[PDB]
Design an enzyme around this catalytic site. Sequence first.
Site, PDB file in Angstrom:
ATOM      1  CG  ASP A 404      -2.052  -1.092   1.054  1.00  0.00           C
ATOM      2  OD1 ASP A 404      -2.290  -1.574  -0.073  1.00  0.00           O
ATOM      3  OD2 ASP A 404      -2.692  -1.405   2.075  1.00  0.00           O
ATOM      4  CB  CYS A 438      -0.480   1.232 -11.547  1.00  0.00           C
ATOM      5  SG  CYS A 438       0.198   2.808 -12.070  1.00  0.00           S
ATOM      6  CB  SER A 439      -3.917   4.186  -9.509  1.00  0.00           C
ATOM      7  OG  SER A 439      -2.660   4.750  -9.205  1.00  0.00           O
ATOM      8  CB  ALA A 440      -2.041   7.988 -12.087  1.00  0.00           C
ATOM      9  N   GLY A 441      -1.198   5.191 -13.951  1.00  0.00           N
ATOM     10  CA  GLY A 441      -0.426   4.677 -15.088  1.00  0.00           C
ATOM     11  C   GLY A 441       0.933   5.299 -15.289  1.00  0.00           C
ATOM     12  CB  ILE A 442       2.759   8.052 -14.370  1.00  0.00           C
ATOM     13  CG1 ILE A 442       2.221   8.633 -13.063  1.00  0.00           C
ATOM     14  CG2 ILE A 442       1.869   8.478 -15.537  1.00  0.00           C
ATOM     15  CD1 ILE A 442       2.139  10.132 -12.990  1.00  0.00           C
ATOM     16  N   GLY A 443       3.527   5.792 -12.022  1.00  0.00           N
ATOM     17  CA  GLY A 443       4.477   5.378 -11.002  1.00  0.00           C
ATOM     18  C   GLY A 443       4.860   3.897 -11.034  1.00  0.00           C
ATOM     19  CD  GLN A 485       4.764  10.217 -10.378  1.00  0.00           C
ATOM     20  OE1 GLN A 485       4.289  10.942  -9.491  1.00  0.00           O
ATOM     21  NE2 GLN A 485       5.290  10.707 -11.504  1.00  0.00           N
TER      22      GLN A 485
END
EC number: 3.1.3.48
Length: 504
Positions: A404, A438-443, A485
């Site tokens: 998490d 993932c969520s935003a697709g960057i980290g 990120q």
Amino acid sequence: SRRWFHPNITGVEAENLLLTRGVDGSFLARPSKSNPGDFTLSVRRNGAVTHIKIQNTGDYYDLYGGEKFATLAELVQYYMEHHGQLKEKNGDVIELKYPLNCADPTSERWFHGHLSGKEAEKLLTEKGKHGSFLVRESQSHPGDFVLSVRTGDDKNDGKSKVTHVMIRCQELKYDVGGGERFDSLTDLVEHYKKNPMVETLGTVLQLKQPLNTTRINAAEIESRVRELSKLKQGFWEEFETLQQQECKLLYSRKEGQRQENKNKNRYKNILPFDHTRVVLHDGDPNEPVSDYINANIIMPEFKKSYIATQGCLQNTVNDFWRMVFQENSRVIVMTTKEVERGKSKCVKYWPDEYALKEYGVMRVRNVKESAAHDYTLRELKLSKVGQGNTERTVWQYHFRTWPDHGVPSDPGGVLDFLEEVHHKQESIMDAGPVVVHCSAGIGRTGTFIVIDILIDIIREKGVDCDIDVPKTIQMVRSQRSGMVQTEAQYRFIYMAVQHYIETL
Ligand SMILES: N[C@@H]1c2ccccc2CC12CCN(c1nc3ncc(Sc4cccnc4C(F)(F)F)nc3[nH]1)CC2
């Protein structure tokens, strides 16, 4: 370079810089001295300085009482171009007008601080090529500097040389013994990059690139990790130095900004670059725009390509399967749970095991799920409704155990997973790009893609080959905003690559 970012200043210093050299609307950004991921935006208004906290927990930059962003340079760009959006708690508008530039050369890629001429010659002779340069402090003349540049033919034998150029500091300004006098070392270097110096006998002192210090021999990664671990730490400096290059990557995201696509973005300001976005064809003529998904093609450049994308929204699931179908993708990598820390990160875009669902013009059957320790594999069959002969198997690799907060405590789970993904993709003749989200697709998405790219170099070339972690990340960041990120992710990339090498 990212001039409004001042590394290695305090809050008190920031205030004084803004009060002494700034005006109302002047601003700067700075990192925490203790914490990678914590940043402050400091803004002069009404004769005083307001400080606004920014946090990165791995998926995006979160401005307190503001919006979420892929990079600090995209954050700054957004608030400089959209008046009234940044507000105090009482409603008052905080205006970002005038970037206050850092005059400190320390963080510049070409700056080497206390470094001898002998040492500079060795570094340039061993690691440098034509046009490689650095700047160092003068040992003889305190406050002065020396520019050292390698020139020659890159195809040893006297065909290359190192030239040293003295930089005087006279009355707070820098020069090379004639011509213009500059307010900073940075301004001087930038001027002579654009306008090369020429010697008496014709040699052009081309400042083509800063000396590369980050490229390594992959077999020696353990020693580099040891060196970067030394104590703030080497890893933090490297990730920050890379971050200072992000203003070169402010490419247009006009299509993502269109009103007709506003509901197709999970985070309003985390958008795909126009030049690499996945363009969707054969769309519903009734939809105002049907060609848009928040996704970019990532092509390594120095065979396999990727689509980096966000976690599906309820209203983009049909677009997602249009993308998968159109691009002929046969492997999806999902690196989030549906819900983490109480928050939805990705809507469920796949059917339950043994079920069939329609998603607009597409249908997906979930044939079988196989549960491993760190991941679940779902064997999906995708086809166009009306056309059974278009059916193809799409293998969804769902990584379940990413923590998490922060990054996994070891890389073995990610490595095993990526190895199964690689082999599945390699086994399917004519498979399209591997979809990664993932969520935003960057980290996390960026982290998994960069690991995969670096591992693939080693697959091809063996362990006796050059790799360059920050170079590779900059190349991926040119194709989707803010890929990788955090400093914790950066270290994890090194950890994953090291342990790949160690398990051969
Ligand atoms: N200024 C520093 C300082 C201060 C006091 C004393 C000595 C020194 C040396 C110093 C500068 C040289 N070093 C350094 N670390 C870095 N980390 C990431 C990057 S980015 C990169 C790398 C490779 C290719 N392409 C890029 C790109 F630009 F495209 F992103 N560059 C780096 N360069 C080590 C640190």
